[model samples]
Each structure stands twice: as C-alpha cells, then as structure tokens.
Target: TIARTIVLQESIGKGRFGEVWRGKWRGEEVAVKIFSSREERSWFREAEIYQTVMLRHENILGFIAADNKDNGTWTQLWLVSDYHEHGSLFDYLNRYTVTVEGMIKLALSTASGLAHLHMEIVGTQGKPAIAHRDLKSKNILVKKNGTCCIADLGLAVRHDSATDTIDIAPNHRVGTKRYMAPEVLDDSINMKHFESFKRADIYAMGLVFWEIARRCSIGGIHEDYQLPYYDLVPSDPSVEEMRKVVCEQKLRPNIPNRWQSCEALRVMAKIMRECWYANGAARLTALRIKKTLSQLSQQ
Candidate 1:
C-alpha cells in the first residue's frame, strides 16, 4: 500500500544518515528522507517524534508518512513530508539577499516554531516541551511565502511536565560544532534541567539570527553571506576550535554600527547579543524571543 502511493525521485540533499529525495505522492509533491539499512534506528526514532499529536503547524514541517521496505538482503526507511522548492534557508540566503520585510517574516516564523516547540500543553493528548538540540540554518526551510519552517527532529529532545522528567538520549552525542553554546562546549551544563537544553537552542538561534542579519539588504546594499566566525574558525571546525574561539577568546559575532540605521536590523542585533551569554541562565527564552520579534514586526 505504501509503495504504490508514492514515487521517489531525484536526490535533493545528503546527510550522514541518509539522502533526501523530491518525490510525488498521489500527484502531490513531497520530500522523502531515505535512510539505509544501517541507520534504521534513526529512521524509526525520527518517525516516532514526528507523529506526536497536536504537533502540526505552518512553522513546522508537515509530516506525511513513514514506511520501511525490504530489499531481499537489506531494508530502506523513508520519511515523507511537504516539499518546499526554496530548500534550506542556508541555500536560500547564499543565493539571494532578503528585504527588511522578508527577513522579519523568516525570523518571526522561526521564533514561532521554536516557541510552539518549547510550549507544553496540558491534557491526555497534549504536547510536551521540546527543544531542537541541533538548530541551525541548514535544518530550517524557507517556504514560497517568505516564511520559515523548522525541520530535522532526529536529534531533538522532549520534557514531560507531569513527572518533571527530561526525555533525552543517554548517549546521544551529535550536534553542529560551529553552533555549540558556551555551556555545551565547557560540558558544564546541567543536563538534568530541561531549561539548559532550551538555552542551548537560544544560542544557536542567535547564530542563525546573525546569519540572516548578515544578508539583510538596506538601501540595496548588503554584506556577503558568511557563516558565524568565518574569519576565526575553519570549515568543519573541531569542538576544541569552537571552544577556544567562543569561550576563551570571548568573541561574539561583530555587530556593525551600520545596523543601527535600520530599526529591524538594530533589534535583531540586540537579540543576538543576549542569546550568546556565557552563563546559560542569562540567555533569552524562546517565548521572549518570539515576543520581542512579534512586537518588532508591528512597529
């Protein structure tokens, strides 16, 4: 039944776990993430997380289906979702500069997704507080309407309030080194506390904000797109490289004085500064980040 409904096509992207394909399902376009035999566990876990009830939102990737197939000697796992031709935000920013209104829409949509992810609803079929342990430009997608959607829940964690228990993988050790938080780099964060994980997300959120801010075009002039710490760190930097550059050097991304000329850019700069605090306790919460940006949009 599953095999007959969908047709997997060309590869859109590749990850360590699998390759993503642009597919057609019942004549509807969708993106299918295909995992090989060895990574079946990852495929199963992500599918489980995606099926959480009341989890659907415009800011979040829409889940379509999950299926596994046997190829005589091995298996293939597939995850299908709504396809956005714009692709990842990373690719989008690299190719085009964004207007003031466009940047605000993208940023606010991202914040909305994170806030909804971090919110815990109460009931028999309610949502728990979740944290995107690996938030980055690469994992976010831009829709045709200029808004963004949060994707890639393979490494995310959830917290159940009823038991006050944090649900995290005991040996789950994978995240982008370039976006590591100070507490995460120092290994001093309290894993027992769920808020610590949320704070780490805020740190990555700041770096993501910096990425978008760099591409903000003012008066038809904009800076070239560059990853955070482009001058200080090498591509595929190790954890030690990030630790020294972030914790030891005490360097946050340079906030140009030119940004002050634009109100939206200035507010984004302010938000970025607060998100990279050395003390995890001092960082902004996703809700506050959403509130600040929401207020900024109306002004």
Candidate 2:
C-alpha cells in the first residue's frame, strides 16, 4: 500500500460543510477540504460534476483529486483542488484597486467561464448542460495572469433527458440569501425552469459586476473602499426588509455624485440596472452578458 504523505499546512477558509486547508501534495501546493460523513455524498457528487461536465473551461476551477481514509473514529473524505492563493473576489477587491480596463477584462473572463458551463456539451453519455446554481463573487478565483475562474460547483445541477425539469423544489431556498433573486425568495412565483436559474445567476452576476465597477471607480480615483447600497441592509435583516429592498425598493447602483459625468460610470449604472430588472423574465441571459462585456472590451 502506498502511504499517503500529504501534510496539512494551515487553515485557509471555511465553507458550509467543511474547512479548507493549505496542504502539500508531492511538494506542490494544493487545497484540501475535509467534509463530514453527512456531506460525503455531496463531495463526491461535486467532484464527479467537475470531472465529467466541466473539464475543458480554462476559467472553471479544475479538480485535482479526492481521498477517503477509514481512520477508525471517523471516516474522513478529503477533496483536493488547485490552490489560488489570491483568494476570493471579496478579498481581492478589498486589497487591490483595478483600472477600467482591468474591470472589463475581469467581467469578460467571468462571463465566458459561466457561458461554457451553461452551454450544451457532447460527451460519452450524451449532451449535458451545466448550471452553477450558485454564482457569486466569492466563488470566482483570480489567477496570476489576471484571468478569473469560477470555483466551487458544489451546488451545480446538470440537466438531462432522464431528469425532470421540476426537480428543484418550488420552495427550495438554495444559494446565499444575499444573492437570491426576487423569484427565488417567492415560493408562489411561476417561471420557466431554465429561465429561473439563468435569471437568478444573472442577478448575482450583476452584483458582482457592480462590486468590480465600484472598486474600479474608487481605485481609479484613489478613494477609499466603499460598500454598495445592498450591503447597507442590516447584517440579519428581516425577510420583510429583504423583500422591501429586493421587491419594492428600487435600490440601484447610484453613480458617485463626483463621477456622474464619467462614461464608465454611466455604463456601469446601465449594466447594474439591466441586472436588477424588476421582472426576472426581463433579466439578460448569460450569453447576452458575455456579448455585452465583449462589446465593452472592444470599446
């Protein structure tokens, strides 16, 4: 038997089900996550999805390996993946200010990665369409070359002929509450299956775009880090509060009074509005988003 020689270096971060650790694998850096037995199935499922459905995207985090050891007291399953020390988008934006060109590049990279996942792919089994289910800034990774990749597909769902479109519970409140779209929070709502997921993802993507825009605006002007309006809502605000803000409250990204005339600011404001469309059906598709960002890139 080949002895497992991996040594845990230090704690990196935490997720809903496990803690992340920086580890050494054959003298190379990697991320290892130890999940509970209850979540063992999810760990395997996430790995399978990544290995099977998302193997080609340059911007999709690649899976490295998985290990399960029967250590008597408790069975531990460790998921190993590439390590991006640059950390989450939250940390990245908080640390470095980006220029307008940088922000547009980031947006294009992220949208392209997402578009790859959402696209239909041919495989041994057949064609499969992948949905991230939970797309947010925290799950996006920034590589050394300035390219960003989407990470953490734990909540991803694949569509197939055998699977019914209605598998997602009407009331299923998946994903981060802060990023949930209006339809996601309202159980009584009716929507097209794929459309719901696409719109929800776009809404979250818009917030991420807003974050980048805000950081770029301040960073370009050499100002302090500023939180967006949505962050102003109390930490544990009531559902009513959320509903009011998400539904009735038309809180959109406001142009900093100072940069009201800036073309970049105007573009960002319009982009943010398109993301927060009152009707979920009206929100842009991931493809449209990619196209918009592509055009912005050319500009």
Candidate 3:
C-alpha cells in the first residue's frame, strides 16, 4: 500500500502520455508520472513490470507506487519513482561534456541495466526477461553519481518461458522511427522469436552509445551533441523514410575518426559496429556489451 502522504508539487516534465512532477513523499522527494485516463494500459503495464519479483536494482528506476486517486472530481493516475535532480541522460549530455572516466561509467552502468533486464533467473519466483522496446537516451535517467537508470518501460516486452512467447505490447507509430533497427524498418523481424526483440534493442542501444560517445572530451575537444542520423533525416520522419535510410542505404550513426585517439572511445565504436549489424541475429548480446565495457573501463 502506498502512503497517502505523497504530494505532487511542481511539474518537472511532460511526454506524449502525460506529465511528470516533483513530489514529496514522507519528507523524501520523488518523481510522479501522471497519466491520462486514455493511457491506462501504459500506466498499468509499467506498474505490473515494476511489481515483478527481484526487479529492484541500482540501475533500474526505483518504482514506488501506482495509484488512481479520486477526490469526487476527475481521477488522477500516478506512478511514483525516485527523483534524481540530474534528470535524463539526454539533458545531462547536452549540458556538460563527459570525461573518459565519466563516459565509461555511464556506458557501463547503462549496459549493466540492460543486461539485467534481459536476464531471466531460473526459479519458481524469478524475474522474466524484459526487453526495453524503446531504448533511447531520453528514456534513461542520470544519477547523482553519474551512473544511469533505465526508465520509461511503457513499451517493454516480456518473454514468457512457460509459454515460449513474447508478451508484446503496442508502440505508438513514428515515436521511435530514428532508433528502428534495419530488421524492424524492413519488417523482416521474426516477431515469433523473442530474441528478435532483444536484437532490436541492441541496435537502439548502439545508437544511444553513439549519442554519449560523441560528447566524450579527450584533449579538451568534443563533438557537438546530435541525434542519431540527424544529418540524414528530417524532424518527424516516417517509417518509410527510416527504412530507406537505415535498411536500403545501410546507414548508421557516424563513428568519428577522432574516437581512435582514445582507447575507450575506440572500444565503444567497435561495440556499436557489432550492435548495428544489418542482420539482427549477428548483433552482440547485452551481457557481452556489458562485459566489454567493464573490461574497457578497468584498463
């Protein structure tokens, strides 16, 4: 049961589904995502995933409660979570350049979060494997210590091993066209195979790394932040446009030659190459990417 003491104060941000607010919960601050009644499924789906056993982790957003409040007026649906003043990774990277160490920490932490999400522990009361269908910088939050927590699991898919099927959910069209994998863009992804969804996540994860690495400052120089394929696509691009650029043209986010000057950046670029394979089956697994980044950080 959630405490009724949770009080929403100021609006922090807003998305397609609803608005987020900075709230006070028993003297502690929290982020409250308020959704419209029309977006009930997304609210319920995320709440369901959050309630899964063994889902708690440092790199995953801390879920507090999901409640629909009624005050003899309109109902307000709320999803509460830990509040980090740093905000999303998208906002963080745009404001400040990261050092080599900071970049590796962020990358490693984010990959660790993804690996855990993709891992299925074998037990009667274990966690099911989850693929973040929407893996983008904006969906990740930055912690005070510079690590990251994966958020916005509204479009996440879970693999049900007992039935050997993926519990696929809906995706609003064109919202994530820029991050679509070639297989997804071409409509050749094997929806029946759960691994296919994970591969698509890897493809998007590679693009996310590209976004982070571009702002990595070595020798007091860093590239300006830009979205993946910013140079090739227009704002509000359609699926057809993404397919032409991502599938037909075999285009990927640019891997700057300047990355070769830094060992960490070089390794990150190599991992992105493995993740951006034209064939989804050829992409590296989240665990592998996590391991690679860990070793690179240690070196």
Candidate 4:
C-alpha cells in the first residue's frame, strides 16, 4: 500500500486514539492519524466506516487509506485522509471570525455532510444510514475553500434496516460531555431505535452551529469562540455535571441578544433552538437543518 511509502511530517494534534501527523503520499500531502495499539478497535471501526459504499461526499472528509505497520517490536495503525491546512472548526473559530456568508457556508456544509450520513441508499451497492456519535467542533475540519468537512468517525454507528439493528462500535471512548444531548446525558435515549442516535447527532450539530454563529461577524462585530455551555459548566465537565445542566436544569447555550439584530443570525438562532429540543423526537433532522440553511444562504 502507498501508506508505507508516505513521508511523515510535523505532528498536527493528538486525540483519544493517538497523535496525528502531516504526511506526504506520492507527493500529495495527507493527514495521517497514527493510532496507538490500545485503540485498535477505534482505528478499525473508523477504517471500516470510511470504506462503506457510497460514503464519499464533499462535506465528509475524504478517506485515503488505512494500514497497519509492524516492525517486529512495535505496531502502528494508520488512517490517512485528505489534509486540510485550516484545521478543525474549533481551531479556526478561535483564530478568526467569519462573515454571514462564511458562517452559512460552514453551517450548510456541515448539515450537508450530516444529512448524507443520515441518508440510507437502498441497492446492492447501497449505504446504510450512519450516525456520527461524536459530532463536535473538533471533529469537523475546515477546508481551504472556507467550507467544513465532518471527520473523526471512530465513534460512528451504522443502522441496518433489514435486520433492524445498529452496528455500534466497540470502543470505550464517549462523546464530549459538553455536547451530549439532554436525553443522552439523562440516560433516557432509546438504544434500540436508530433514529435516536441520529437525533442525538442533530443535538450536537446545533451546538456546533452555535459555536460557528458566535464567531460570525455582523457589521464587523462578533464574539469570541466559546464552546457550548462554557459558562454553565467546567471546561472538562463530568457526565453527571452535564446531566444536571442539560437535563435537570434544562439550560442550553445562550444566544446573544445582538444576534436578533441580524436576519441571518436571527434565523440561525431559531434553527439552533429547534435542533436543541429536550425531546430528541422533536429535534430537527439533518436534512431539515440543511434545507433551512440552504435557503438562508440564498437570502
């Protein structure tokens, strides 16, 4: 495989799985995620999900290849994907603000990707509907064209309609506590229903949109990037802490009053509210969010 010939470059970042590095494959730069042996399941799950038929889309991170390198004493699992210099949405928003158009582009593209994941294509070479369990700003990469792509599918799950089952990954890692939906944090989510997982993803998507919306510049004015519930909970909050805030208290990230002054921001705030209903069943779907944002982009 070309994975063996790829030239490793600078370390990009680190996550629960392991460190990521910039690598060169056939003179083309790529993002290589080197997984620790302990996270073999995560590596394998992500690789398997990436290879799902008809999974490729512009808003979804482009998977290049996956390989295991064994050098007798040590082994490394590598998952390679397209390299984006702009980095994660979390990193990008922290560094710079965006125009209304920029925010819509980011928001719409993210929904487009999420919608794709939630869509089931039926046929011999069709795709099973997938849910991104860990849908956070850090898992979304910003492409050079001012758009974003969904990444980090290690926690993703697929739904099989024929069997009426969910292919949940075997991994210890959990979704970010700060982004957990009320039902998820309260342990009331229906595990047997595949739509439950997708709804949880929409809940997380709403949070991600809030992160992007705050940094959007309206009349050359914008707020600093803040994670969801940054003011309500500790930076690294516990699951119980999150449950109290999200489920018991029934509180969500505050949309600034100034946002109401801008039509785009106002509409975005409305969408976020709809997507964040305590009842997962009532939350907006990815396709609905995508359609709403698509219309907003044209306005």
Candidate 5:
C-alpha cells in the first residue's frame, strides 16, 4: 500500500521531544508530532501504548496514524492524533471563569477523563491499569464545548503487580516536579515506591481541581496557576521540598471569601484537602472523587 501523504499545515507547539504541527490527514484535522532523534524511541513507546489500549471516552485522546521515515537530513517519526486547539487547561484557566453550571460541567468532564485513565482496563494484556506519571494542567486539553480531555500520555505506565516495583527512568524535571508526592521524592521512606505514582497522580488531580476552583471563583493568583508554596525551602528545593509542601505543609486551596456562599466551592475545597493527605493511603481514589463531584453537580 502507498504511504498516505500528510500535508503539514502549521507549527502548533514545542516540547523536549520535538515540535507538534497542525496538519490535515485525508481532510481530518490532526496534530502531528514530529519527534527529534532522541525522542524517536519515546514516541514509539507511546504509540505502542495507545495501540494496545482502545479509546473509549471523548476525554481520552484517540490515536490515528504514525510514520517512521528517513528524510535525508533528519530521521523523523510522526504521530498523528485528534487535534483540539483550545490548548492546555493551564491556558484555559488563565483566560476564563465559570458560572456554577459551567463549573459543574468542567468538574464532571475532567473527572470522567481522569477516572478512565485511572481505572480503564486495557493494555498489551487484557485491561491493564494505566497511571499517568505526569498529571498536570498543562497536559489537559479543553474542548470548545467546555469538556476536557487529557493529552500527552508519553509518561504513562501500565500497572503490573509483579513488575510494578521495577525502576523506570526518571521523567524530565520540567513538569514532573510540581506534581510529585512526598514518597516519590524520598527513596528511603518510600518502602512502596512503585505505588507512589498512582497516589501522586491523585495529589496532582486534587491540585488541578484546586486550580479550576481558584480560577473560576476568583482570578489567577500565583504563577502558572500554582498555589503559593511559602514553606518551600528556597535555598535547596528538591522534589522532596515540594512534596513536603504538598503533604506536610498541607497546602490548602485559597478559596476567596466571595465564593463562600457557594456550597460546591466549599465541598471542592474539602475534597482537595483530603487529596493532599501526606499518607498516600488516606487519599481518595479517582472513582470516589468522580462520585463526589458528580453529586455536587446534581446539587
């Protein structure tokens, strides 16, 4: 079969791997990620994961095509995916606020997406549990309908009970730092280090919810939608430092007094607090979070 040609439209975004392009394949809008030399294998790995796992929800990014070609100057591996130009949740929250109706839609949509990733059973083997090692606002994509979908599963992992404890290579220090849990930072105390990813993901999800709450209720307060981390030891802040801020410091969501009359806001604040629990076991599961947010929406 002849390799289908993809016409590059325009450059969309850049990352450690390479640049993403806004492109069209057979008249469909797609985001084509062209991997650099170093990122070829990584892109391959992500493709493998996506192929093994079927897309079920509107929130999970669906895979379309991939091409590994040897162009004269550079070896290129192109990955095609459904394109949503609303960009990251970070960018979205920076620009818009929600009415109570809007907030409920946002929360339910986000929770549905996350719950699918957290509990979805599909992999190379039957129904492999997936954990997004890197969960952050920047990785979430907002749809025009106000529903959201998660993007960039390059750092995702299949949870295997037997081999779960195996050490994977460390992720890039860029987006991984802020979402890390305390146990992830300190190896000595991390007796069950492998389990930390799911727990840390929960913590990060809580932070994401907090970001939604803060932005919808008030306005952008901190840099990049980050909650203030006054307790961070400025001199030598490691992943552990931020982890302490998350766990021990009990970084609470800054709920503006103006939103006090809103019961949903108060409940969301309470849920975020529970998610930041230092003891990973104490944190609520994604399913529980989804249920809570669902009820809040109905109310």
Candidate 6:
C-alpha cells in the first residue's frame, strides 16, 4: 500500500540487497530501499529491528515504513526511512574537510548512536542490546546538522538477557574488510558473549573515527580522505590480507603526530588507540566513548 504511493526520483546507490532511491511519499521526501525477492529475509529482519520498542533515537536512522508492492510482473520489497541530503560519511568526507567542531559533531553523534545500540533497558517497554556487525563510514549517514546517524541494521545482532543468547543475523554478507577488528579478522573473537560483539563493533568504530579525523583541519592543514589501510591493502582486500595486517602485524591506522597540537584531535587519537586494542576486553565501552567525545565537544 505505502510502496505503491511512493514516487522514486533517482537512484542513489546499490547494496547487497538492492538499490536505494530518493522518493516522495505524501509530499514528503524519504529514502526507499528496494530489495530483491531473494533478500526478503534480510529486509524483514531490518524492518523488525527498526520497529523495536524504545529503539528510536536521534542518532539512529529513522525508519518510516516497510511494505511490498506487486506490480503484476514482479514484487518490489520497499523499506522506507528518513532521507539525508548529505548521504554517507564516506561521500561527505571525500568532498570536504572538517573543522574541530564539525569533527566533534560527527564523532559525538556516532558514539551516541552506538552507545544507545549497546544499551539494554529492563522493563515491559525495554530494548535489548544490539551490536552492529558491519559498522564503517559507508554505513553511516550524515544529517543536515553535520551530525551522523548509524544506518544498515541488516547485520545487527540482538542480545537477549533472559536467555543470555544472541540473535545473530542469518546472512552470508560479510563485514567490510578494512574495518574488521583484529579478533574478527583472525577468527579468535568469542562468539559466546555479547560484550565480544560490542567490542568488535568498537574496533570498527575506531576505524571510522580514523577516517573522520584524517579529514579534520588542524593548524590550517588537513589530509585528503582515504580509507583505513589504503597503503597496506588493495582496493578490495581479501580476508587473509586483512588478517595478516590487523592480527599478525598488529598495526592500526596511523594517527599523525600533528594531531597532538590540537587538543580535540589529541583526545580523539587516544580514544581510537584504546578502541583498537587486540584484547576486546581492553577496549573502551561505547558509553565511555560517548562521554569522552561529549567532553571534547565542549572544549
């Protein structure tokens, strides 16, 4: 019903599921994710997760509706959400450099979103902790206010406290190679505990921070945007290639020494280092990261 009413304007991008488009619904603009029939499970899971009680937040992507429209010849599975003009962080960083304030707004909102996803509330109206298995710059969208919101929840895992079990996504889609944590790349990650999943997410979040920080202007100078490990790996790296670099060599994305001159970048560098620890337990929690970034935003 809802899908039939939307008027798609232009194709924005493609993903594992299908193409995303700029669409109009009832005179309002929205992003419509049209999925292939084969990917219906993934689409359903994401829409279900989006509609969870108490899941709505400022930093998280806003989900409007989900429906399937059959045009006789074929069925179009539509997942609609709020549209952002700026698009993904990847595209945004490629086009412009950020000031200290801009960097903090992006970083702080990202941490806030992750913190909310990792938080569990206990009661009748409660939310289970969710871990984003595929966190990266391309998976985050930049809002009009310069802040960011986490998107693409198809690979997200939910932790059920009552059963102490995780509801992992039943899909073969892999995480972005460049953002995989050491343990994740090496296959040493503890699958039994929910914290392990959250820690892995933190590691990927560090890489996203690195991407944003590199483009931040400090002392009137800023570097061009590059994906993490651009020099060490190929454009499309294999799991083995990433494993050798992340796990064997234990090398992380470089934090330029010049960042030390700016207090905001200095603290961001520190947080990134803590987040990329080989031992998942050693990494900082999302809430802790959110608090630290919150403080830096004021400074």
> Model 2 scores what on Cα lDDT?
0.73
Q: Give the C-alpha lDDT of model 1.
A: 0.88
lDDT of 1 by residue, 1-299 (tens): 66457787877878758799888887879999999878878888798889887788899999988987676887788888999999999999999999888888889999999999988888888998888888999999999999999999888888888788876554433789899898888677788888988899999999999999889998887888989989899998998899998999989889877899999999999999999889989989888989988998897
Indicate the worst ten consecutive residues by lDDT in candidate 6: 166-175
1-299 in candidate 4: lDDT tens per residue? 76679889889879877789999988889999998798888788789999999999999999988998876899999899999999999999999999999999999999999999999999999999999889999999999999989998878889999989887733433788888888788787788888988998999999999999999987778888889998999988999999898899999999898998989999999999998999988889899999998988887
List lDDT for all candidates, in order.
0.88, 0.73, 0.87, 0.90, 0.70, 0.90
Itemize residue pairs with steric clashes in candidate 2.
none
- Spell out the clash pairs found in candidate 1: none
Order of quality (TM-score): 6, 1, 4, 3, 2, 5
Residue pairs with colliding backbones in model 6 are none
Residue 33 accuracy (lDDT) in model 2: 83
Please write out the lDDT profile of model 3 over residues 1-299, one tens digit for every residue: 45367888898878758699998988889999888788897788778888878888899999988888765767778898899999999999999999999999898999999999999988878899988888999999999999999998877888889999777643433238889888888877777788888888899999999999999998888999899999999977889999999989988888998999878988999999999999888889999999898888877
**Candidate 1: residue 95 Cα off by (Å):** 1.0
Local error of candidate 5 at residue 269 (angstroms): 0.8
lDDT of 5 by residue, 7-66 (tens): 788988786576888887777678888887787678887777677544457887767777
lDDT of 3 at 201: 88
Segments of candidate 2 deviating more than 4 angstroms: 1-3, 123-127, 161-171, 188-192, 217-232, 257-265
Per-prediction count of colliding residue pairs?
A: 0, 0, 0, 0, 2, 0
- Provide C-alpha RMSD values for all models, in order: 1.3, 2.8, 1.6, 1.6, 3.9, 1.4
